[PDB]
């Protein structure tokens, strides 16, 4: 699924991240729009031979199991394929284990590089939240 922008800001604040640990729901919004442009099936692979899947691109290293990056861990307990779904559910949920770990959002490259210090509101301007 390839959400709209307000559509997402609608899921994302029913499924409470806005204000998660202390980030405005304008944060998430940017971060998705950078890592996957809003499509929940993107995947890419990294040099290190993990995978990154989702809306929030979401590492294979630490956070899910696909069955083919030797030695990782599985700390959301779930198949990453299960991040794909047009369901944002498990995605938001693992997420809030990340930002959780003590480095916050700068767990997103995409994030820390093109939303950190700008008007992230913008994001859900116009939108009926
Ligand atoms: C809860 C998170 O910490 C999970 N964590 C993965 C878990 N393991 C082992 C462990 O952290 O107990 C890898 C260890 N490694 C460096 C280290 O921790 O010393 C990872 C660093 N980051 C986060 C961070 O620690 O900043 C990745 C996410
Ligand atoms: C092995 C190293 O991770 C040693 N570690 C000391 C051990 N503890 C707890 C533990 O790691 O079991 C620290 C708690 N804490 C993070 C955490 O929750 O693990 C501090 C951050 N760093 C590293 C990091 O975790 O990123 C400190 C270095
Ligand atoms: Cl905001
Ligand atoms: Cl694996
Ligand atoms: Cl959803
Ligand atoms: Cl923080
Ligand atoms: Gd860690």
């Known amino acids: 699924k390839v ?9 994302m604040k029913r499924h409470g991240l806005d204000n998660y640990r ?13 890592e996957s ?6 995947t890419n692979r990294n040099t ?3 995978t990154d899947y989702g809306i929030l691109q979401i590492n294979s290293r630490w956070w899910c199991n ?3 990056t030797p030695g990782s861990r599985n700390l959301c307990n779930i198949p990453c394929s299960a991040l794909l779904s047009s369901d944002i559910t ?8 990340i930002v959780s770990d003590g480095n ?10 093109r939303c950190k210090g700008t008007d992230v509101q913008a994001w859900i301007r116009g939108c009926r939240l």
């Open 3 to 11: 959400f709209g922008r307000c559509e997402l800001a609608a899921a």
């Open 22 to 34: 202390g980030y405005s729901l304008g944060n998430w919004v940017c971060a998705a729009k950078f």
């Open 37 to 42: 442009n809003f499509n929940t099936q993107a």
């Open 48 to 50: 290190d031979g993990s």
């Open 66 to 68: 696909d069955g083919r």
């Open 90 to 97: 498990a995605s938001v949920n693992c997420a809030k284990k």
């Open 104 to 113: 916050g959002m700068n767990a997103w490259v995409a994030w820390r590089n």
